[PDB]
Design a protein around this ligand. Structure first.
Ligand SMILES: N[C@@H](CCCC[B-](O)(O)O)C(=O)O
Ligand SMILES: N[C@@H](CCCC[B-](O)(O)O)C(=O)O
Ligand SMILES: N[C@@H](CCCC[B-](O)(O)O)C(=O)O
Ligand code: NI
Ligand code: NI
Ligand code: NI
Ligand code: NI
Ligand code: NI
Ligand code: NI
Lengths: 314, 314, 314
């Protein structure tokens, strides 16, 4: 595929600051080189320089709103830029709050996009239902059209315009959903496959249904927002909000291999990788290596193997 | 649900004594508080005080028969008490021999009960087929109606009256069954899903069949006897008889989430958790935390989330 | 079953030399005693004495060709010997290059054999497509009838005569296939179930299809070549070419339990176990114990249990 890499070293959507190193550790693992080692056309747009917003007091319970709102507004512009360039945007992120800007900018160019959100969490708390105040657990609430009128005017997000309907998104991997978030899921009728469904159906049927659900009516661009805590912490331990009983390494690769095979991937987010949280140097490399593997699968790397359109035996 | 907690610090059904700490470590993990944090009405009946039976020599090969028989006779009375109180009995146990009293007392009030036994073992050795002499590996033999006449009059169990037919029980998780036990399984035609069946069908179909098998003819109270060694030792390491290749954390939660959803759970046993056997302080907390998670799922905690019957967005 | 054990302490098919200890550590774990503990008739043909071929310079890129070719030629003769004795050959090996001789000797007596290759790799590189030069990653290329004319005359293999068609083999567990190997797979139309297929279908359906694929037309002898790196390194860490996201312990036992149940197993290879590569004494015992478990399942050991044709209750 044709990829446009965007580094987004941002962490103000949650407490821990090490998430800002995501772009760096991922690049160091040879992500660019590896993508090119495939049938991939890669153009790196660099790391977006996020300026400090020294004066950013909480809005009610919500923390660092102006900093988060500015980082997403900026990211939205860059993403829309790479999309206008006929490239699949690859956002190497910090925290998941950046999804607000990534999906927003993606939808400007492709308003008909469908979203696949792999995460242990729904991240759909409103500024009024959140208990932590961390914006990385509220991105979806700002993007849903049906929730407009329920989201207060939070400083830093006046530029936001809900771009996706509750019907254009599917969750995969849920295992720690807040009560208000659960109420929102059932009320707006959002499609999801919690770990319970994955256990019941198998990742195979889950992906069959997910894609059918989003592309049955018509093929449309796909945005995959992958939070690394969606995978079990035995695979991605260096992350801020780990939850046991997650998707396996294999299921992670299955999801992405299937997404790739649709040929419809147009936007990708690799989020919440925080090297600073590894209990050992190995947990860091384990988290980074898994994050990279997931990324490569999104762009063609298949476990059964790959080969060029040439005669290898000759 | 409406729960009646019963602590049963007993270990004479096997060699290791640390199993007697089960009720304590589980309570310390905040089990009561956590259940109440749900739509749960909790009444704790305390820890049953098991008196010492100093004079308890083996009956043939069977060890501590009078001590085990007395502990089960006592537990049976308490369980029947909580059942008469319209509450689901939750037996925080020591070793699995206590299942004799738990199921017995449960059946006094609800003679039509069906049993789901999650375990790596069948625990159906008779006093004559057992090679270890440990009674925690023989509870089922004392409960089956079809085995009466094959169980000798063992000191301490004259109060026992087989309350369940081979047709009212289903095993899930088997991977270390003795030859005589296997002979009993095939001969009495007991329904089971060994790890081989779980691998073949998937935990989803396994639960579909298990519940259909026990409730197809008519809905009836369900007794879930959960031996923590049914789960893989990577999840519940602090237990006396671990066996590799066990049920996963996810499968453990799936089984219980499905049981809960039947609305028919009326008796639950959480057994064999032995803190003293953890190779590290973390293996102990890992075993206890998993045991607690399984318990909460039996009473409504769902991985997709939970919410009260109120308007969260208002 | 009736087993003929053959120890093959050979490692020249790859760089690391510790693989030569496979037969020793497996025997020390009590493999013979354990098989006999079952309804197994065991005859050990000892460890084949592989003489040193001091003068063995590379053939182009291929390493230790004469040593590897001689070790396989020798093994082929022994395997054919045990087969003529009405016994299932059990090759406790070193590296996977020995599969050349094992399958060759097996096919002399049973030309209609079908092959099941459990491995993370296809091991089908030709002397011309290999990049490593290690012959343990090329055994299949020497055995396929359809590849004859594409394999150069490599010193030490003039005795080789392709004995299996691309249609008589099934791969299970693939996750690291080279480009040329992938080209060969799709070109010769070889049937395989990479980790992607296992994830999609489940090991249950995978085995249903595998056996149906090989025995649908007619029942025929089965040769199972099991490379321990086919299993995840969390189960078999002491091996030379580990690859994450492998088959689970359970899936490993499922495959073999199903193979056993066909009653058609006639040739088995347990390869690539290298004690010298364990990062700890426990990783070695973990690798060896798993390798043994897989072996026992091939010969009847079932997770649901086993019993003799006698009355256990009497
Ligand atoms: N639901 C919690 C945790 C959200 C976790 C955010 B995430 O998924 O981006 O890591 C909260 O609102 O603070
Ligand atoms: N079958 C063995 C082990 C039984 C294990 C008992 B259990 O399941 O309660 O831990 C025995 O009879 O000693
Ligand atoms: N494909 C690689 C690795 C092969 C691994 C060989 B095996 O499967 O026997 O361990 C190579 O040709 O060197
Ligand atoms: Ni998350
Ligand atoms: Ni998230
Ligand atoms: Ni058990
Ligand atoms: Ni038990
Ligand atoms: Ni291999
Ligand atoms: Ni191999």
């Amino acid at each position: 595929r044709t990829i446009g890499i965007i580094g987004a070293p941002f962490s103000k959507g949650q407490p821990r600051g090490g998430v800002e190193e995501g772009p760096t550790v991922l690049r160091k693992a040879g992500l660019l080189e590896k993508l090119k080692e495939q049938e991939c056309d890669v153009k790196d747009y660099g790391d977006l320089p996020f300026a400090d917003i020294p004066n950013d007091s909480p809005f009610q319970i919500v923390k660092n709103p102006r900093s988060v709102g500015k980082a997403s507004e900026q990211l939205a512009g860059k993403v829309a830029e790479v999309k206008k360039n006929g490239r699949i945007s690859l956002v190497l992120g910090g925290d998941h709050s950046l999804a607000i800007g990534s999906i927003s900018g993606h939808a400007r160019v492709h308003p008909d996009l469908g979203v696949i959100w792999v995460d242990a969490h729904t991240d759909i708390n409103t500024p009024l239902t959140t208990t932590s105040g961390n914006l990385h657990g509220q991105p979806v609430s700002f993007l849903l059209k049906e929730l407009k009128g329920k989201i207060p005017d939070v400083p830093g997000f006046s530029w936001v315009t809900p771009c996706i309907s509750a019907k254009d998104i599917v969750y995969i991997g849920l295992r720690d959903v807040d009560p208000g978030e659960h109420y929102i899921l059932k009320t707006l009728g959002i499609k999801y496959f919690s770990m319970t469904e994955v256990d019941r159906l198998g990742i195979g049927k889950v992906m069959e249904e997910t894609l059918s659900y989003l592309l049955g009516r018509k093929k449309r661009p796909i945005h995959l927002s992958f939070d690394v805590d969606g995978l079990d912490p035995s695979f991605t331990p260096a992350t801020g909000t780990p939850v046991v009983g997650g998707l396996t390494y294999r299921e992670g690769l299955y999801i992405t291999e299937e997404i790739y095979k649709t040929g419809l991937l147009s936007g990708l987010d690799i989020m919440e990788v925080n090297p600073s949280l590894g209990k050992t140097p190995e947990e860091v490399t384990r988290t980074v290596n898994t994050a990279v593997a997931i990324t490569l699968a999104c762009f063609g790397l298949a476990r059964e193997g790959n080969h060029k359109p040439i005669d290898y035996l000759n």
